[PDB]
């Protein structure tokens, strides 16, 4: 209790917190700790709720005033640790790195080509030295972007005509396959693809130039609306991957639509013109742009936008795709891997307010590209 000779005497828990109501301080002094009193201040007024062993699944029970706190282990949640944590591809992507699938209320993790599923069933071990998608004041026409470093952009390639002039980009998918836009085929009759390019005016020894052997455009290409604007090139010489030459991983359609396209930002690399009606960039450059919602995308476009196109970029910043990057990939940087989700299609002006770069959707065409990699392979 609170008295004038009681507290005057050194407080004892056996002489205050027992016969008396054990209100406080006499509930703390003798204990001289907030890590022992608070645990004794709830076992004298409302009782210890942990005497019933409520926290199941070997959880920890801590006593509080009016309730108890349960400590549950990994995969256990709920008020009293009675529930297993339901794993879904919506919540933390089902812990899968590349491919998450839902079967019988269970999460199955699978890895793309060049990766093996780990022993624990969650991680993806690369199967080779250079797997896909794995990296190893500036005025005067710079659209918010940075310069591509060595090993940072190895999946980009440039197409040059007979005069060695760059006109379109390309994404390396394998030792033989380059992905670009269909209209790039109409720009030049014959062209060569250079991979590992860092500067068109300087050969640094890492650029490999290949002739194009097989050309496959989309059959449903339309000139009026630029629809189905995608092309596949099979090169005459094999691509030997190295420091500055690496492929990119092709994701799954449903996973790309549910998780990859919900990422806030993506990356597009290219050699194209630095600004509208301007000179071509001497060196490879990349730009990070966010996804644009479909309603404003269709409201801001004077032309028809189908299910195979989407808007990306900034409404206010001077940052958007421009001509010369046609056929360049739009890639999203997931936890440890780059995944292709789009391909540059076009853009009404460059760095223009109220306009967004239109990118061709890879997901609706992946099934076709697979055929293009086995129909003539
Ligand atoms: Ca005391
Ligand atoms: Ca006391
Ligand atoms: Ca006693
Ligand atoms: Ca006492
Ligand atoms: Ca007494």
From Swiss-Prot:
Inhibited by SERPINA5 and SERPINA10. Disulfide bonds join 17-22, 50-61, 55-70, 72-81, 89-100, 96-109, 111-124, 132-249, 148-153, 168-184, 297-311, 322-350. GO terms for molecular function: calcium ion binding; phospholipid binding; serine-type endopeptidase activity. Its main location: secreted. Changing residue 327 to R: In FA10D; Padua 3. Changing residue 283 to A: Reduces activity for cleavage of PAR-2/F2RL1. The modification (3R)-3-hydroxyaspartate is found at residue 63. GO terms for cellular component: endoplasmic reticulum lumen; external side of plasma membrane; extracellular region; extracellular space; Golgi lumen; plasma membrane. Changing residue 297 to F: In FA10D; Padua 4. Its EC number is 3.4.21.6. It holds the Pfam family Gla. Changing residue 294 to A: Reduces activity for cleavage of PAR-2/F2RL1. It is found in: Secreted. The vitamin K-dependent, enzymatic carboxylation of some glutamate residues allows the modified protein to bind calcium. It catalyses: Selective cleavage of Arg-|-Thr and then Arg-|-Ile bonds in prothrombin to form thrombin. It comes from the Eukaryota. Changing residue 163 to Q: Reduces activity for cleavage of PAR-2/F2RL1. No significant effects on factor Va (F5) binding and activity toward prothrombin in the prothrombinase complex (F10-F5). The active site is at residues 183, 229, 326. Changing residue 265 to M: In FA10D; Roma. Belongs to the peptidase S1 family. The two chains are formed from a single-chain precursor by the excision of two Arg residues and are held together by 1 or more disulfide bonds. Forms a heterodimer with SERPINA5. Interacts (inactive and activated) with ixolaris, an anticoagulant protein from Ixodes scapularis saliva. Interacts (activated) with iripin-8, a serine protease inhibitor from Ixodes ricinus saliva. Interacts (activated) with FXa-directed anticoagulant from Aedes albopictus saliva. Interacts (activated) with guianensin, an anticoagulant protein from Simulium guianense saliva. Factor Xa is a vitamin K-dependent glycoprotein that converts prothrombin to thrombin in the presence of factor Va, calcium and phospholipid during blood clotting. Factor Xa activates pro-inflammatory signaling pathways in a protease-activated receptor (PAR)-dependent manner. Up-regulates expression of protease-activated receptors (PARs) F2R, F2RL1 and F2RL2 in dermal microvascular endothelial cells. Triggers the production of pro-inflammatory cytokines, such as MCP-1/CCL2 and IL6, in cardiac fibroblasts and umbilical vein endothelial cells in PAR-1/F2R-dependent manner. It is linked to Factor X deficiency: A hemorrhagic disease with variable presentation. Affected individuals can manifest prolonged nasal and mucosal hemorrhage, menorrhagia, hematuria, and occasionally hemarthrosis. Some patients do not have clinical bleeding diathesis. This is Coagulation factor X.
């Amino acid at each position: 209790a609170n008295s004038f000779l009681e507290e005057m005497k050194k407080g004892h828990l056996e002489r205050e917190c027992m016969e008396e109501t054990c209100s406080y301080e006499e509930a703390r002094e003798v204990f001289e700790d907030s890590d022992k009193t608070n645990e004794f201040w709830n076992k004298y007024k409302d009782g210890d709720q942990c005497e019933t062993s409520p926290c199941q699944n070997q959880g920890k029970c801590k006593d509080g005033l009016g309730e108890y706190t349960c400590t549950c282990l990994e995969g256990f949640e709920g008020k009293n640790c009675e529930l297993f944590t339901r794993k879904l591809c919506s919540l933390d992507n089902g812990d899968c790195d590349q491919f998450c699938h839902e079967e019988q209320n269970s999460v199955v993790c699978s890895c793309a080509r060049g990766y093996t599923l780990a022993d624990n069933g969650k991680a993806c071990i690369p199967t080779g030295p250079y797997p896909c998608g794995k990296q190893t004041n500036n005025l005067t026409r710079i659209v918010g972007g940075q310069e591509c470093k060595d090993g940072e952009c190895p999946w980009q390639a440039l197409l040059i005509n007979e005069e060695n002039e760059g006109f379109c980009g390309g994404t390396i998918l394998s030792e033989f396959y380059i992905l670009t836009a269909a209209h790039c085929l109409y720009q030049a009759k014959r062209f060569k693809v250079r991979v590992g390019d860092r500067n068109t005016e300087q050969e640094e020894g890492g650029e490999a130039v290949h002739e194009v052997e097989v050309v496959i455009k989309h059959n449903r290409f339309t000139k009026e609306t630029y629809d189905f604007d995608i092309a596949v090139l099979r090169l005459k010489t094999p691509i030997t991957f190295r420091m500055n030459v690496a492929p990119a991983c092709l994701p799954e359609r449903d996973w790309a639509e549910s998780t990859l396209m919900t990422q806030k930002t993506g990356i597009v690399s290219g050699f194209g013109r630095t600004h509208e009606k301007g000179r071509q960039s001497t060196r490879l450059k990349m730009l990070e742009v966010p996804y644009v919602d479909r309603n404003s995308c269709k409201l801001s476009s004077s032309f028809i936008i189908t299910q195979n196109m989407f808007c990306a970029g900034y409404d206010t910043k001077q940052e958007d795709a421009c001509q010369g990057d046609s056929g360049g990939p739009h890639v999203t940087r997931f936890k440890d891997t780059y995944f292709v989700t789009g391909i540059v299609s076009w853009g009404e002006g460059c760095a223009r307010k109220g306009k967004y770069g239109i990118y061709t959707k890879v997901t609706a065409f992946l099934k076709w590209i697979d055929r293009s990699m086995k129909t003539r392979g």
